[PDB]
Design an enzyme around this catalytic site. Sequence first.
Site, short mmCIF file in Angstrom:
data_model
loop_
_atom_site.label_atom_id
_atom_site.label_comp_id
_atom_site.label_asym_id
_atom_site.label_seq_id
_atom_site.Cartn_x
_atom_site.Cartn_y
_atom_site.Cartn_z
N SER A 37 -9.99 35.78 -78.41
CA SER A 37 -11.25 36.51 -78.45
C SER A 37 -11.40 37.50 -77.29
CB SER A 37 -12.44 35.54 -78.47
OG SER A 37 -12.61 34.70 -77.09
N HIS A 95 -14.90 36.13 -72.42
CA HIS A 95 -15.52 37.05 -73.39
C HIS A 95 -16.03 38.30 -72.69
CE1 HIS A 95 -16.29 33.78 -76.68
NE2 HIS A 95 -15.10 34.34 -76.80
NA NA Z 1 -11.36 31.01 -79.92
NA NA Z 2 -15.32 33.72 -79.79
#
Ligand code: NA
Ligand code: NA
EC number: 3.4.21.105
Lengths: 4, 182
Positions: B111, B164
Site C-alpha cells: 500500500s 501510508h
Molecule cells: Na496491506
Molecule cells: Na491499506
Amino acid sequence: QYSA
Amino acid sequence: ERAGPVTWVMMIACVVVFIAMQILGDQEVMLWLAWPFDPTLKFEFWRYFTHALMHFSLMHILFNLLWWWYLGGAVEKRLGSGKLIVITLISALLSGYVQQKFSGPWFGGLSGVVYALMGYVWLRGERDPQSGIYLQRGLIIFALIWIVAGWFDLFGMSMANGAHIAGLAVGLAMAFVDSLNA
Ligand code: NA
Ligand code: NA
Ligand SMILES: [Cl-]
Ligand SMILES: [Cl-]
C-alpha cells in the site's frame, strides 16, 4: 502488527 | 495484454510470498523479509524493501494487487518499466523507514507503494495532463475512499499510518518533480  | 514485466513480476512475487506465509505462518516469513528488527540484521539489505511483499490478509493482497495492476500497469506502459521501478524502490524504502520510526518494524504490505502510485498518477495527470497518465474522476473518488478507510482504520487490523503518509508523499513529490520537465 501493522498493514502498509 | 496489459501487464508489463515490472507490474507482472511484483504480482507474482506478492503471490509467492503470500503462499509461503500460509504454509509457514506470517511470523516465519517476517523473520526473513521484514524490516531489520535486530541490529544484527542491519546489513541484510533486501529487508529495507521486502516488507512490501508481505500481506497479512486476503482482502488486502487482492486490493493492493488490483490497484498495483491498474496504476502500476498504467505507469509502466505510458512512462516505462524503469519509472515504475524507481517509484516502487523509493516508496517502499521511505514508507518502511517512516513506518518503523513511528511504530517499529513489524509491518508489511504493498500500500505504501500503492499510495505512492495513487498520488503519482493523480498529481501527474492534474499538472502534466498530456503525458498520458491521469486518474479518472471516478477512480480517484474510490482512491480517496480507500485512503480515508486507512486513515480512520475502517479495516481489520491496525494500519501502517506512517507508511501510508510517507508513500503518498513520495508519490506526489515525484509527480511534482516529473512535472517540472516541460
Ligand atoms: Na496491506
Ligand atoms: Na491499506
Ligand atoms: Cl494483464
Ligand atoms: Cl502507524
